[PDB]
Amino acid sequence: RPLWLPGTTPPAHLDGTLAGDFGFDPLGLGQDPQDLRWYVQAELVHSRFAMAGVAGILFTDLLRASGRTDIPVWFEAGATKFDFADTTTLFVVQLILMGFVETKRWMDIVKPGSQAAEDSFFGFEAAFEGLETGYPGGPLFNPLGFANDPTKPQPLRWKEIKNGRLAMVAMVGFMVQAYVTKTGPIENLLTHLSDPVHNTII
Amino acid sequence: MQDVKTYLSTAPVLATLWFGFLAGLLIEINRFFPDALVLPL
Amino acid sequence: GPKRGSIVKVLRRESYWFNDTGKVVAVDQAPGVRYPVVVRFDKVNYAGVSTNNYSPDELEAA
Amino acid sequence: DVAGLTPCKESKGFAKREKQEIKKLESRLKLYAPDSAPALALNATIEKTKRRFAFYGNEGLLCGTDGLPHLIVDGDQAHLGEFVYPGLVFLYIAGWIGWVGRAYLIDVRTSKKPTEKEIIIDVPLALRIMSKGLTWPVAAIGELRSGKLVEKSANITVS
Amino acid sequence: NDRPLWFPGSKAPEWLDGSLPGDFGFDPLGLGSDPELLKWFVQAELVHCRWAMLGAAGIFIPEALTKAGILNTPSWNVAGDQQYFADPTTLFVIELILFAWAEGRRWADIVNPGCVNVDPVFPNNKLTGTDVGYPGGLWFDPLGWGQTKDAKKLKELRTKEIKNGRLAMLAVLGAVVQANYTHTGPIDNLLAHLADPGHNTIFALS
């Protein structure tokens, strides 16, 4: 398989069969069993949340540049916008909501039985995933039954994080750019395409 | 040449090289960023 | 006492090597020896010596 | 504001602490020609003084009843640039140093002559460890959680 | 075993044997004692003489063509203070970005020989070099020269190359020093010298 640098010298704690593996652990970060079985899930949730953030950042500024809506900028949407409720109330409500889901995910990470629902739904309300790691299922998470077979989801499970890493670096780019240019990201890109050899890092 | 590298791997020589490089770094920083009392970040 | 080349940990309360490990050299098997076990350590004491003899009931952790 | 100190860009005692120093420098300057090394050095010093005094007022430090900045090492959000912001980077650097030193000791200790590798450093291994010592918190906390950070059979004795 | 030395009557050092091209037994300070450092210093000197060839050809020929009433490029000293479409810092950043790739692949070749030879986009191009430092391949060797009999056509060519490269290094260092001693172009030095080789030399200033 290909590695990050062609002078490979690949590490031992990660050998193969892992989705999106390129032997990139130069700083020996996860070398212990718990460390790897935890960092896989960490990278998964990070990739997914950053993909969601990218999908919520691009579309808005793109359509606003091409003239479709009058929504505010990403670094201005949450920034002092009285829209429906008090922002702090929404923050507290979001924390109380995310608690009941992050606790379930934690439970399944540490002791992988959490599929059955509650409130007298002990019957036909089981989550039918049964995966190796934190990949849920059931109509509540995987309605269309796309994750069909094991030992050949590696293309799709690879695509997931190969897009999530790009989304993560894209999000960091969004933050740093909109912090140092004080301008929209697609506005930055257009002003760059105006004359590339003059619009660079200061 | 091997014994020369071993001698350069001694404690006083590595100490003075490290401290001189650090002194140069700090001196350059202070010549370019002088009178720093509060972090502007 | 213990076997040769065995790694034992000391329990002598007034020893420099207390709670430290060392490999036996050769335990004397005479009838009336009070401290037959001979153990050499990889760190000298305040006097500079690294070998010392103990009784078999005075040091064992394996 | 806090602690009865006024901001420095309004302190009527900072103006004097500036103009007196400026006038002293100019009195020194008037002993040469405007095209000589002492005059150039003194003008550079004056420009540096102006650039220094036109930065403290803009930062937000609070001056005293004598016209001197005072650091509010309290946790005040309006003053994080005085203690906690530089303190965090210092703690980062110091943890870096300590972690890479500890790791070098741990690695050297399992060798043939570990005492030799402490008066004669082996630059390849030391450099490797210094490089890997960038993510030291994620490693120190991981070693704490995994029970690899501390020993239990310490060799202290007291009769 | 018979070969000429940099110092007739002397004895070639033990770590030098004339196996590698350009060898004349010149190593007084013993800077190439162990082979671990020799295999690195040979690549250092090779890249150095090639870069110096490029730099000397870029400095001396345009100067002559400017003095020959043909070209009008400025002096080699002040080629930085000119008008290009981007600042020197931007061009330097682009240079470093482009050079990181090439120099990293060369570094990987030096450290682990042969670990990097195939096109990572079209995995069939397979550079044809065999010895580190001479990468071969259609890109770096179109005219086929370089794959010949084991010696006397390869070793001869390589030593004839290093012999030119050392001269180029000396020449460019000399141009650098002259451009600061006598504030004229490098060809003006030659002109003034040939005009009066008796009184026009380094001693004609102090």
Ligand SMILES: CC(/C=C/C=C(C)/C=C/[C@@]12O[C@]1(C)C[C@@H](O)CC2(C)C)=C\C=C\C=C(C)\C=C\C=C(C)\C=C\[C@@]12O[C@]1(C)C[C@@H](O)CC2(C)C
């Ligand atoms: C998840 C993420 C970003 C998520 C962003 C989100 C949700 C954005 C949300 C919002 O925009 C919306 C939705 C709407 C806005 O109104 C509100 C906000 C809130 C603004 C970034 C991850 C970002 C993660 C990043 C950048 C990670 C980079 C890692 C790199 C480069 C390498 C790391 C290493 O681990 C390796 C690989 C090997 C080790 O040996 C070496 C090291 C270095 C340790």
Ligand SMILES: CC(/C=C/C=C(C)/C=C/[C@@]12O[C@]1(C)C[C@@H](O)CC2(C)C)=C\C=C\C=C(C)\C=C\C=C(C)\C=C\[C@@]12O[C@]1(C)C[C@@H](O)CC2(C)C
């Ligand atoms: C690489 C090199 C030159 C490269 C030139 C370049 C890139 C050209 C650059 C330019 O085109 C640009 C960029 C812009 C142009 O407008 C201007 C310039 C600036 C001109 C010279 C090397 C020059 C290197 C030189 C001259 C080295 C001489 C070394 C010697 C003699 C060493 C001898 C010993 O090391 C041994 C052999 C053995 C030991 O035991 C004994 C001792 C003595 C230690």
